[PDB]
Write a protein that binds this DNA or RNA. Sequence first.
RNA 1: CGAGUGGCUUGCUACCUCGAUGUCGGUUCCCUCCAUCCUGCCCGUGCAGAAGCGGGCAAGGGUGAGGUUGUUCGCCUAUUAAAGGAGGUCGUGAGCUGGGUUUAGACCGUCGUGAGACAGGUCGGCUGCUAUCUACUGGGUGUGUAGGUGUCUGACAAGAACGACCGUAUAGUACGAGAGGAACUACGGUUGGUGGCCACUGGUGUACCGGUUGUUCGAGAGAGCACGUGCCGGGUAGCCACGCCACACGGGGUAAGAGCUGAACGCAUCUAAGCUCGAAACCCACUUGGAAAAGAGACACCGCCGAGGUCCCGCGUACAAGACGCGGUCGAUAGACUCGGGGUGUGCGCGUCGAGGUAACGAGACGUUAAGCCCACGAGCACUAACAGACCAA
RNA 2: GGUCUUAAGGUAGCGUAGUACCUUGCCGCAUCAGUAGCGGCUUGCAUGAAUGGAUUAACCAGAGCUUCACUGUCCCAACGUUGGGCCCGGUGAACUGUACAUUCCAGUGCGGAGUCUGGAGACACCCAGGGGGAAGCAAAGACCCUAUGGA
RNA 3: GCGAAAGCCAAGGCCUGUCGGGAGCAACCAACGUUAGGGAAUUCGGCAAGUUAGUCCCGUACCUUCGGAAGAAGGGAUGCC
RNA 4: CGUGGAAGUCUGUUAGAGUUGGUGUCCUACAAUACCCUCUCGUGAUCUAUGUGUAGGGGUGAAAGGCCCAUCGAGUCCGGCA
Lengths: 132, 337, 53
Amino acid sequence: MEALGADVTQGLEKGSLITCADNTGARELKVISVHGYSGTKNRHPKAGLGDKITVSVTKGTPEMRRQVLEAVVVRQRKPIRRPDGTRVKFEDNAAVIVDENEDPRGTELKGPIAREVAQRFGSVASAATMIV
Amino acid sequence: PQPSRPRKGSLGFGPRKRSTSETPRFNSWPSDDGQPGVQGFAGYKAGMTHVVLVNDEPNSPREGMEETVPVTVIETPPMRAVALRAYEDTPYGQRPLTEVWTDEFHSELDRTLDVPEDHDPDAAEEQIRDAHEAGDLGDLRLITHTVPDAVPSVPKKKPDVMETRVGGGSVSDRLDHALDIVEDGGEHAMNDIFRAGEYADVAGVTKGKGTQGPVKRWGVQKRKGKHARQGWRRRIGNLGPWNPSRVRSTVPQQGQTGYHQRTELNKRLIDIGEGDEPTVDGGFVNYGEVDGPYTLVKGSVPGPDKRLVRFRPAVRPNDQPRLDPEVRYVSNESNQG
Amino acid sequence: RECDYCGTDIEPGTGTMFVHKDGATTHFCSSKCENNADLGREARNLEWTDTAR
RNA sequence: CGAGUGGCUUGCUACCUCGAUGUCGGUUCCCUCCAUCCUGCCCGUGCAGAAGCGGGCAAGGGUGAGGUUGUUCGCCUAUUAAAGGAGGUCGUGAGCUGGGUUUAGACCGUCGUGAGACAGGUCGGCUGCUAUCUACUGGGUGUGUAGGUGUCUGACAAGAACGACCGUAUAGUACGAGAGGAACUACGGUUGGUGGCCACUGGUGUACCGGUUGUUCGAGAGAGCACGUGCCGGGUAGCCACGCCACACGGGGUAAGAGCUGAACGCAUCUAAGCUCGAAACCCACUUGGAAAAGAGACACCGCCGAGGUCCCGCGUACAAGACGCGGUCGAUAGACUCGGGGUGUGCGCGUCGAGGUAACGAGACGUUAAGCCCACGAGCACUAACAGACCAA
RNA sequence: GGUCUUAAGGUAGCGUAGUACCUUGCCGCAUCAGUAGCGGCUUGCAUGAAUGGAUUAACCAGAGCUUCACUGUCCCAACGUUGGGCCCGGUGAACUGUACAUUCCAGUGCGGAGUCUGGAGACACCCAGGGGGAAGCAAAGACCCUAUGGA
RNA sequence: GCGAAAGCCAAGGCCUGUCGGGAGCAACCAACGUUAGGGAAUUCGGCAAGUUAGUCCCGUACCUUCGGAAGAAGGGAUGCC
RNA sequence: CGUGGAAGUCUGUUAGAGUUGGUGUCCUACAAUACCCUCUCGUGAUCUAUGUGUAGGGGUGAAAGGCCCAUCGAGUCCGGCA
Ligand SMILES: [Cl-]
Ligand SMILES: [Cl-]
Ligand SMILES: [K+]
Ligand SMILES: [Mg+2]
Ligand SMILES: [Mg+2]
Ligand SMILES: [Mg+2]
Ligand SMILES: [Mg+2]
Ligand SMILES: [Mg+2]
Ligand SMILES: [Mg+2]
Ligand SMILES: [Mg+2]
Ligand SMILES: [Mg+2]
Ligand SMILES: [Mg+2]
Ligand SMILES: [Mg+2]
Ligand SMILES: [Mg+2]
Ligand SMILES: [Mg+2]
Ligand SMILES: [Mg+2]
Ligand SMILES: [Mg+2]
Ligand SMILES: [Mg+2]
Ligand SMILES: [Mg+2]
Ligand SMILES: [Mg+2]
Ligand SMILES: [Mg+2]
Ligand SMILES: [Mg+2]
Ligand SMILES: [Mg+2]
Ligand SMILES: [Mg+2]
Ligand code: NA
Ligand code: NA
Ligand code: NA
Ligand code: NA
Ligand code: NA
Ligand code: NA
Ligand code: NA
Ligand code: NA
Ligand code: NA
Ligand code: NA
Ligand code: NA
Ligand code: NA
Ligand code: NA
Ligand code: NA
Ligand code: NA
Ligand code: NA
Ligand code: NA
Ligand SMILES: [Sr+2]
Ligand SMILES: [Sr+2]
Ligand SMILES: [Sr+2]
Ligand SMILES: [Sr+2]
Ligand SMILES: [Sr+2]
Ligand SMILES: [Sr+2]
Ligand SMILES: [Sr+2]
Ligand SMILES: [Sr+2]
Ligand SMILES: [Sr+2]
Ligand SMILES: [Sr+2]
Ligand SMILES: [Sr+2]
Ligand SMILES: [Sr+2]
Ligand SMILES: [Sr+2]
Ligand SMILES: [Sr+2]
Ligand SMILES: [Sr+2]
Ligand SMILES: [Sr+2]
Ligand SMILES: [Sr+2]
Ligand SMILES: [Sr+2]
Ligand SMILES: [Sr+2]
Ligand SMILES: [Sr+2]
Ligand SMILES: [Sr+2]
Ligand SMILES: [Sr+2]
Ligand SMILES: [Sr+2]
Ligand SMILES: [Sr+2]
Ligand SMILES: [Sr+2]
Ligand SMILES: [Sr+2]
Ligand SMILES: [Sr+2]
Ligand SMILES: [Sr+2]
Ligand SMILES: [Sr+2]
Ligand SMILES: [Sr+2]
Ligand SMILES: [Sr+2]
Ligand SMILES: [Sr+2]
Ligand SMILES: [Sr+2]
Ligand SMILES: [Sr+2]
């Protein structure tokens, strides 16, 4: 994929429970897989800010609940390094559900987003109220 | 069927034993292309800081923007090319033919060598030129030594001697180029060989750690779960199968880890200067204050503070040189805190 | 830059930036400041802090 | 239908072991095979393209995470370039585990007159030993080569030190009616592996500083104990990973294959002689080791009454003993002192305030006070200690 | 089949059961995915009424399963603490020992060799290590068969 | 303090749960402390560890043999002067 | 509403009794059954000292073929016995 422009320490793993930052009807998401990732023996497949991940809907409306959808990691508690050396971290771990064309499923994004994610996923960015 | 997995550690840096010389020895030199010149230099590791730079890479979207880069500070005072050793091409490889020495010797070189009192430079030189005529002259290298005395933070005064190759143009021209350098007093500097922005190969003898187990030394796993409580925590599963009935040298075992020679490739020289511009407040921890000829190597450099490191023009660079990088800022913040 | 907590100048190529839930951004110059901030302490009340003094 | 190869399954046999070669599955760590799953290079196509299908060379590297089940096997999910198979006493219990098989207790079903049985099910049910030899990982002492110091050489040896993927431009282009949709090359990044390093972020930090509970030293001050810090907060150096740095290109020779020239065979023919090409594979390149390479090596200087070394002394860039490195007054090697640079967070005492209380008394607030206390780092500094002095040696 | 063996011919219930071979039975719940667990069905290889059936509040170091919470169980390991380990003084065993013994790759041999054969490698001695081999040490195999053995 | 509980301390007893010296004291082992992000992905199985916790106030489901379930659950409070 | 204070009743390392898991430590042990943490019972079919009775095809047994002096699907000693 296109460079993020930031070093990321994946703060999530397969099976992790994160926040679904949007109005799709899905409240809590469960990480199932990480797009384009291949681990090593005994390693839990890791995911971090800027990654496209397969996801499971744990909490939310009956219609959204139990569905297997794709999402993009928008925020993570574990720090990331910016080109100027500074570290950046968020209040929570969040992702936004996405379609086949990488366009946000819902109409509105909740909470802030990373500028690096915004650059990689344009249509997701052009839906963000705040970009840090 | 039990998953595949790369082995623990590399079999390319063995045997993993204590190094013979604390002074690194390059086992390879750069090519003979440009003008005649010394193919290496040396200094003493001081410590680290970070620097702010302007992106030199024309292929980066961040070209022109400020970038924070980690840097190791190395005191690189002038050295002395005390002699010129010539090698001859024999059926059993290269062998030392003769050497051409000098008159001027550093006041404290006798702490290591049995300094020459009666030498014949002319005769040796002739022998070398005769071998050149015969078409048997191998390569030309200079016997060099550092001046630890020039570095306050370094305790030793006993100089560190190391042979450095001279490559460049025609053998005839670099022979003369070498001889001239030696004649004066052999005094040369980092400037003479390197330019900020070039890629160098840094060789050094790693930080010593004495004996360590397979986990640390080879990166093997620790016993997991229930296995970690039975009486085994950091011991490998087994020393090998029933057959072959012997332990293979390839299985991760305990032993000397650290204090080995390493040659780190493609190290960018961020800046070569002189003074106290890079010194940290309160002094570099476990080293001291830098105020003299130094070099700023991008990233890490093998070895502890005070250790002798060697420089050599990158033998296999991946990028094209982006000379004299613009240094917007050099951190002087204390390394304590 | 200045530390949004203690108030001293943040050494360039150092520090962390905490992004609050609402999108607010807080530049910390060190772990010490972040930790005192997490204890619910307010810079003004701490004598060693450049803000207070 | 016919001919075989293998020795992974099963069966057969009864050679070997019954004065015992510890089970299945799993795990961990190492090596290998190729009948190749991916990756490289190729041929064919019912090959437009894209995506496939079949075949050839090829074992360098890779082949991962999870849900049920003790399971092996297998079924299933989502990722993936792909999530290949097999051998090593069905590798691996003087390594681990002990869920299953297969002791002694018990239940159910079936069978039995019964004791009790079951190639049925089920709950419970133990894991010994101080390594002599050999083997390997690392560390020393001697002898050989036959005075010492320093620098080298390179027989050999090891490596995967690098493997793979995504994205951008090429390009909405070639191709195609359209749908759809490549490549060469150049770039950016990711993943796995590898080696190193700690400026940065992170962890530790029973160094240190602070808060504070119970109790004891009469109170105060200041302390001990509460498991090897009472607990809570912060945390330096160092050590670290979750942090940071680095890990080609190119040559040479080939395989499959594509060809040139070319005869046997006037023609034809990539082959028979000859030649041009051509794989992630081979060799070189690169990294690591390596004078014990018995052809036991080379160079330079110093020295054979003296070069040099060991002991000794102060110490670590070193370290389980040994070894290694540096300094030793012609000195900054270690300590003290003082600065600097750091940690904590405002000391004792006194003054004012303080809800109240007649007063006694009073938790606490402010000031004095960026205070007090503390530092595994640096600098200055010969004050103290590196003294005295011994021995080996061509 | 629309009685026959042998007296009767399975009623209430419960049921893929700690009983169900087929079997991971089928449907549903739950999960990304559930040979598990629960509910329903149930023709039950071979359930069933003091050989007691069903059912059940309370109780349980009893067997199985699910959720919240928590966490170094794991991703993936690091640093530290105390006692050992290592070096020195003193004290001072045991296991084990046909012999020889520096081995490695192959082969051969009673078909599982440090000692045979062919090669390869190999200067001696010592310190520390984790245990690959000595079909390692410890026990005249509990398994199985045999004995005109025992209980 | 509820207490013959913990923890601390007397009286009384003891330094004889009877070998020492040394090395920031390595690997490895026994006990154990702390670990960022994730949070059972580990494993036959949360085995091991951890989480919770004392007291008062509020409040409390199915079921039930009416005893119980029940400290259900959940929420609030807690010092000193 | 109070009084009352029942219970093979609850919590409880009170004393005391017991022994679930760690398949930890040990396994030429401290020990021929030990150590630590964890865990169960703790007014009763309770625990415990001393005294006393039951004896080997016999006792004793809330039954495990458990126990009867480290000895039990028939104790131990000596004899039959070479
Ligand atoms: Cl393990
Ligand atoms: Cl996955
Ligand atoms: K046998
Ligand atoms: Mg695994
Ligand atoms: Mg620092
Ligand atoms: Mg800082
Ligand atoms: Mg054996
Ligand atoms: Mg083949
Ligand atoms: Mg291979
Ligand atoms: Mg086996
Ligand atoms: Mg074994
Ligand atoms: Mg065993
Ligand atoms: Mg053992
Ligand atoms: Mg079982
Ligand atoms: Mg069982
Ligand atoms: Mg069912
Ligand atoms: Mg009846
Ligand atoms: Mg026998
Ligand atoms: Mg039998
Ligand atoms: Mg009989
Ligand atoms: Mg954690
Ligand atoms: Mg698993
Ligand atoms: Mg437990
Ligand atoms: Mg009695
Ligand atoms: Na053990
Ligand atoms: Na065959
Ligand atoms: Na096994
Ligand atoms: Na291969
Ligand atoms: Na499975
Ligand atoms: Na075997
Ligand atoms: Na075995
Ligand atoms: Na075992
Ligand atoms: Na096993
Ligand atoms: Na080639
Ligand atoms: Na019946
Ligand atoms: Na009971
Ligand atoms: Na831990
Ligand atoms: Na062994
Ligand atoms: Na009453
Ligand atoms: Na116990
Ligand atoms: Na008897
Ligand atoms: Sr060299
Ligand atoms: Sr070399
Ligand atoms: Sr065990
Ligand atoms: Sr063998
Ligand atoms: Sr082949
Ligand atoms: Sr292929
Ligand atoms: Sr099998
Ligand atoms: Sr099956
Ligand atoms: Sr295997
Ligand atoms: Sr078992
Ligand atoms: Sr039984
Ligand atoms: Sr059976
Ligand atoms: Sr079974
Ligand atoms: Sr493209
Ligand atoms: Sr289109
Ligand atoms: Sr204490
Ligand atoms: Sr050919
Ligand atoms: Sr020699
Ligand atoms: Sr019926
Ligand atoms: Sr032989
Ligand atoms: Sr040992
Ligand atoms: Sr007393
Ligand atoms: Sr004594
Ligand atoms: Sr702490
Ligand atoms: Sr689990
Ligand atoms: Sr699981
Ligand atoms: Sr509460
Ligand atoms: Sr009771
Ligand atoms: Sr058990
Ligand atoms: Sr013990
Ligand atoms: Sr035992
Ligand atoms: Sr424990
Ligand atoms: Sr109780
Ligand atoms: Sr007798």
